[PDB]
Design a protein around this nucleic acid. Structure first.
Lengths: 80, 80, 205, 85
RNA sequence: UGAAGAGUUUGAUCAUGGCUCAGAUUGAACGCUGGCGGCAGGCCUAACACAUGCAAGUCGAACGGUAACAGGAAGAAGCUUGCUUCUUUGCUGACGAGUGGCGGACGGGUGAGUAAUGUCUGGGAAACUGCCUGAUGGAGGGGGAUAACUACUGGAAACGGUAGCUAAUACCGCAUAACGUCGCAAGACCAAAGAGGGGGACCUUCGGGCCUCUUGCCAUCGGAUGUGCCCAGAUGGGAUUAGCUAGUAGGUGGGGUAACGGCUCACCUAGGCGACGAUCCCUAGCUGGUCUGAGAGGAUGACCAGCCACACUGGAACUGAGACACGGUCCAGACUCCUACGGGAGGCAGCAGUGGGGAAUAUUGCACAAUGGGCGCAAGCCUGAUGCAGCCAUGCCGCGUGUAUGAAGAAGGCCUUCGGGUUGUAAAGUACUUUCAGCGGGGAGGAAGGGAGUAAAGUUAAUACCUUUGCUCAUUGACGUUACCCGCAGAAGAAGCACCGGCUAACUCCGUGCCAGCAGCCGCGGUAAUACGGAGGGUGCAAGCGUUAAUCGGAAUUACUGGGCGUAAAGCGCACGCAGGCGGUUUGUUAAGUCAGAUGUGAAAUCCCCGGGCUCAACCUGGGAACUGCAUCUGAUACUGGCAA
């Protein structure tokens, strides 16, 4: 069981999430498996705030991954 | 490869245990050269099939008695 | 501090002329240079190696207005561009926003230009800029504000600039006071400030 | 120990009380077989194994004894009788 | 793309060599001084003891229940007139406690202990693995109970104990039995729990049976994951620690553990380990990494990340997929507290605070907004994780404390040959601007999801449910009196510290006179002190500066890179020689070393290159490189090593 989730590592009064594959039995900013891109809500189209990896995840989900509200709906914001 | 070390016996005083002595060329990055660092190890043997000073082939493997995890595959020669 | 101390007096203590707080009317007429800063400023000492390096450093240092701490930051940015880091170093000191604006004739002086950068007078694009340590980008849009050309300071600050060489790596404008940082400063655009040898000695310690 | 969840101790205890009994049963029945081994009573060995064969297994499926432990028990046991009777 | 040197021994000189300084830095501390904002960081010492508050529970869609709340109804009142009040009642939301599940092994903290079978790195095989997820099948029919509860009863409390009664996704049979387990085969054997939503046709003495959906439940084999286990190498110091080691080392056979194993046990052998450094002692969390550095290297391991250990001290097992369990349990011990003195309670190395100790380290803050975590079928709750605020120049960075112009070069000092010179365009004076701060007014973005509907070409009852999909609507903001922006007067409110003999940038004047005192080093000072003290002037840094401590550098100053040893420190008094190190030459071979390519692997962050995002930079960030390595695979054969000749 892996758990794909957000992880803010960005400086104060400026969220920079990081969609990561971890496990839920460890720290949000702590122990990770491997990334699956980023989520920046501060992008507004002067830079790209995302990195997809659609492919990678699609394998991981079958491998028993779990998606949190945000992460799941964030594939949805960009659809395919 | 079964992690094969061409070692040289140095102890038949037990039956099914023979201490084989092997070395790797260990380098110092601060003396900046290789040397011979010889390390005796405790191998698990079929019975005995060799004398001392017997060049052999040994291999890694399961543990199966205290400080064992190498086996004798064959006795190369008694003397070179 | 930001210095902003007794300006010219350093020109005195180095015996070398600069426009910093001088006019174009006073050029050491009714002002004095080098007569004797202090009561010992008349007589000249030979100076040790370290002597030269210190004095000379301060020469370059005060015709941008730049501090110590600031200068180190410049030195690790110079040696973080692939080039001659003598050039890179003095290129970045003439990369200070306060300086390019002066060198496009919008500042009366080097120093007065930075008084502008204090207030919301300077801008790049539609973006307001108040920080002078900003190294402008190749092909910039470094304009004055609408509601800043109406001030009597900004009108009078194109005035004192007039009749200078204006070493070209950039455009000098008067329709919209909007230039372009259209190539970098270079060894040829030094105007006899070639003292890159000194400070790179000083700094490497 | 003012916490709510310190009530778990009571739960643990209903548990320990029960889990104890399960271990005890098995722990004894397995010895009745080793009786027939050491004393050499060939018939008995079989018969005594057969009576405890289900028992030790059930507990395991549940998790009391667990799957993997009873495995090795059942191996050792039968092993005895094969070389004996 | 990158490496600085000077002083200090001599009357003078060059070497040799120790010492010093210049530098960067640090969880820094202190003194003096103080404008902000942004970001980061903020008990290192006694792993010392803690007042007080809070951080571990949550699910009624598993229960038996109804205590409260809120509603429904029934009798009744009040007769606020058909409405409020009252008793009754699980009827419905909803939920106390209690059972029961799952979490409570996460996250958070700390480095005491631990030089190692602990870590790190790389391999590896005789392992296990709940929640997740794939595949196949199953889930049949029963029973005996026990909390609660009730009625008592023991105690001052703390805290219990009886008797009767009862529930389950509780417990345990019995039934069923593969790709299952044991077994050579033959054979034998082992499991469960169903809950909800909704509904037409039948059935209910009307709670339900029925069907359908849906999730869950049981098993077995997978996958992914976490966690054990083994091996080799790397891991700190000290040989004024050289001998050590009986479950000690190994072999047999039992037992045990999830699995291998002296893990443990019976017997048998007498070895095993060690200067290629065991064992023992001191010291220390370890690593990525960090800092410094030109690199190599050294030192170091704070915050951030991973691992290990520890949880009042000592110790132990139980449960469970997993623990040797921080806020579990039990025992002992020293503490602390309660007490009706009989007997009991607790554990801040969690957050915040407290005293103490120390040179030193912040609020008994706010919050469910966002992100993440826990449970749940969902709502929702729980969250000192976290996100923020407050307090602190602790540091890095950004910007400001004014701009222009301004000389009979103003008074006022100071020095002076008494002509001035110096302070000094500095100030005033003139024209100019209000950032930042302050006040008043606007004002983004971090917020999507969910929630109330409708659309499905799903599943089935033919459009339920549930899920799915976009759509439709009303909201979701703790920070916060917000990032930011607008206006408002008026330079207004915003510069100091150290040093100036030489090293080393920067001199004079008095006061004192080997006295006073200075002092990083070399040294000053016994009456014109460029070195003291004060002043005038100046130099460098600057909201910080200096001083100290501490690390590394410089220092090739212990030299792998990168040293000497004739006399400066420095060749054992001299031989032989084991181990160790080294190896003339020719052919052949091997390919271990080595080189190359290939493949894994070298976490991320940190670092680095290019390039974005915060008004810029600091910081944050994207991709790529580095990731000095290691192993394996396949190739190469000159050298190196091995063998043969």
């Amino acid at each position: 069981m892996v758990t794909i989730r957000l992880a803010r590592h960005g400086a104060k009064k400026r969220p920079f999430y990081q969609v990561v594959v971890a496990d839920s039995r460890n720290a949000r900013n702590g122990r990770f498996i491997e990334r699956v891109g980023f989520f920046n809500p501060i992008a507004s189209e002067k830079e790209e705030g995302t990195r997809l990896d659609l492919d990678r995840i699609a394998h991981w989900v079958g491998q028993g991954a779990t998606i949190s509200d945000r992460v799941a709906a964030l594939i949805k914001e960009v659809n395919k | 490869k079964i992690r094969t070390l061409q070692g040289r016996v140095v102890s038949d005083k037990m039956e099914k245990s023979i201490v084989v002595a092997i070395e790797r060329f260990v380098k110092h990055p601060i003396y900046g050269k290789f040397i011979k660092r010889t390390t005796k190890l405790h191998v698990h043997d079929e019975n005995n099939e060799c004398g001392i000073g017997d060049v052999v082939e040994i291999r890694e493997c399961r543990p199966l008695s205290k400080t064992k995890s190498w086996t004798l595959v064959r006795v190369v020669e008694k003397a070179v | 501090a930001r210095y902003l101390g007794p300006k010219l007096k350093l020109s005195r203590r180095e015996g070398t002329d600069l426009f910093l707080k001088s006019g174009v009317r006073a050029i050491d007429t009714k002002c004095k240079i080098e007569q004797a800063p202090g009561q010992h400023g008349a007589r000249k000492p030979r100076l040790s190696d370290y002597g030269v390096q210190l004095r000379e450093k301060q020469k370059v240092r005060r015709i941008y207005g730049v501090l110590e701490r600031q200068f180190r930051n410049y030195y690790k940015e110079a040696a973080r561009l692939k080039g001659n880091t003598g050039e890179n170093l003095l290129a970045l000191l003439e990369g200070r926003l306060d300086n390019v604006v002066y060198r496009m004739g919008f500042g009366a002086t080097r120093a007065e230009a930075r008084q502008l950068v204090s207030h919301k007078a300077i801008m790049v694009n539609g973006r307001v800029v108040n920080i002078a340590s900003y190294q402008v980008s190749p092909n910039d849009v470094v304009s004055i504000r609408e509601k800043a050309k109406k001030q009597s300071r900004v009108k009078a600050a194109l005035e004192l600039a007039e009749q200078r060489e204006k070493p070209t790596w950039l455009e000098v404008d008067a329709g919209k006071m909007e230039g372009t940082f259209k190539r970098k400063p270079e060894r040829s655009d030094l105007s006899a400030d070639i003292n890159e040898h000194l400070i790179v000695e000083l700094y490497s310690k | 120990n003012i916490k709510s969840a310190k009530k778990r101790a009571i739960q643990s205890e209903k548990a320990r009380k029960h889990n104890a009994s399960r271990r005890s049963m098995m722990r004894t029945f397995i010895k009745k077989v080793y009786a027939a081994i050491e004393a050499g009573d060939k018939a008995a060995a079989q018969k005594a194994f057969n009576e405890m064969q289900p028992i030790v297994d059930r507990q395991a499926a549940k998790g009391l004894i667990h799957k993997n432990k009873a495995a090795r028990h059942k191996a050792n046991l039968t092993a005895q009788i094969n070389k004996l009777a």
